[PDB]
């Protein structure tokens, strides 16, 4: 890294205690249906700011060999993947691939319904501004499985996809769009993805009345093939780093509201019952 801009690029790609906002790459296979392309376009419109997009045909089958996927992740520093593909057995497939250290952490398949799919342009409403983070609502009994399954992994993928940029504060005007994922415990269950813009009205009390209007896209999914993570890799990925601004609690040491360091002392109960006073001559009868 002789060049300063290249050094900046490698320092941005370096591992950090607080990780960067997450980047997703949208790519296609050799054969991909137009409905699948429209679905990936809608997802890219949801996630424009932190996504990159390929435009060529890739001879990649992720469930056979994902070496090209790992190479693409290492080259583009992308770590979420949306792979579009079409086949006779599976006509409209969205392959959600999640990395960890430029290797495949886990994978999942979604099967798009060609009949009930409606794009964002199919709805005549006001759309979401670019870069706005929507809220998320997950509904149904399919996400409360005691054992990690396809629906739990899909909930993790969708939360990570619509995570956006975390922030400690949010404007109250940034609560106008919600993404709702509905899925039931069960032949295969139907996972439904909807997006709603929020209209708020008076109700005579402090809290307002919330009304929704469909914004798009309209997506129905069947969960298919799933590639589970290795337990050690999953433990290393779910390790939580501690910020230097997160202080380490010391015993009997605190900081008061004026910023002074305050120490605690403990005297204990005063027990003078075992004390024998002096037997003076004047105290004797």
């Amino acid at each position: 890294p002789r060049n300063a801009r290249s050094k900046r690029a490698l320092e941005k790609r370096a591992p950090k205690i607080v990780e960067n906002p997450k980047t997703c790459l949208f790519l296609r296979g050799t054969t991909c249906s137009q409905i699948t392309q429209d679905a990936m376009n809608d997802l890219y419109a949801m996630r424009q700011v932190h996504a990159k997009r390929f435009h060529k045909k890739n001879a990649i089958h992720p469930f056979e060999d994902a070496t090209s996927l790992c190479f693409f992740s290492e080259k583009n520093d992308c770590s979420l993947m949306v792979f579009g593909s079409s086949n006779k057995k599976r006509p409209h497939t969205l392959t959600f691939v999640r990395m960890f250290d430029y290797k495949v952490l886990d994978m999942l398949e979604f099967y798009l319904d060609p009949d009930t799919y409606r794009s964002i342009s199919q709805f005549k409403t006001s759309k979401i501004p670019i870069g706005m983070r929507p809220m998320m609502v997950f509904a149904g009994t399919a996400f409360e499985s005691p054992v990690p399954n396809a629906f739990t992994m899909a909930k993790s993928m969708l939360i990570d996809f619509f995570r956006g940029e975390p922030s400690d504060k949010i404007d109250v005007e940034g609560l106008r769009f919600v993404v709702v994922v509905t899925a039931d415990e069960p032949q295969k269950p139907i996972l439904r993805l909807r997006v709603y813009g929020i209209r708020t009205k008076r109700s005579g009390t402090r809290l307002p009345r919330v009304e929704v209007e469909e914004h798009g896209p309209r997506m129905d999914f069947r969960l298919g093939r799933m590639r589970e993570p290795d337990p050690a890799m999953l433990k290393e990925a779910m390790k939580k780093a501690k910020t230097p601004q997160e202080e380490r609690t010391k015993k009997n040491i605190s900081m008061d509201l004026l910023g002074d360091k305050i120490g605690r002392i403990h005297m204990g109960k005063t027990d003078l019952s075992k004390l024998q006073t002096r037997k003076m001559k004047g105290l004797k009868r």
Partner: protein
């Protein structure tokens, strides 16, 4: 020990002992040490200079001479009954007996000296 743990960053802590003469500063140092390391006498002003005693590796004790903060309302009788001075070096020690007889209950004095029936400090002495 709690103070030493609160100041674990320093190499040690120093504990200086202050008070009037003959309150027991050197005796307290000797009791904490377990050994007669500071000179102890009932004579006021026994400790004249400051002294370091190593209690633990991280705890030092500092013996100090006895101080009397000056007050405009303090009497020589009050200082003598507080134990500031030596009674050998005071002039007319007899005048401070009424203060002692006021401070001490009469029956305690009677049983201390096996003596009953005085009308004043002159006759008691």
């Amino acid at each position: 020990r709690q103070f030493s743990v609160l100041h674990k960053d320093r190499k040690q802590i120093s504990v200086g002992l202050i008070g009037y003469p003959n309150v027991g500063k050197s005796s307290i140092i000797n009791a904490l040490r377990g050994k007669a390391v500071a000179k102890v006498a009932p004579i006021p002003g026994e400790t004249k200079v400051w002294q370091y005693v190593t209690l633990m590796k991280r705890i030092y004790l500092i013996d100090c001479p006895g101080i009397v903060p000056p007050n405009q309302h303090d009497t020589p009788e009050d200082l003598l009954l507080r134990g500031v001075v030596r009674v050998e070096n005071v002039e007319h020690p007899e005048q401070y007996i009424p203060a002692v007889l006021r401070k001490v209950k009469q029956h305690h004095m009677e049983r201390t000296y096996e003596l009953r029936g005085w009308k004043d400090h002159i006759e008691f002495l």
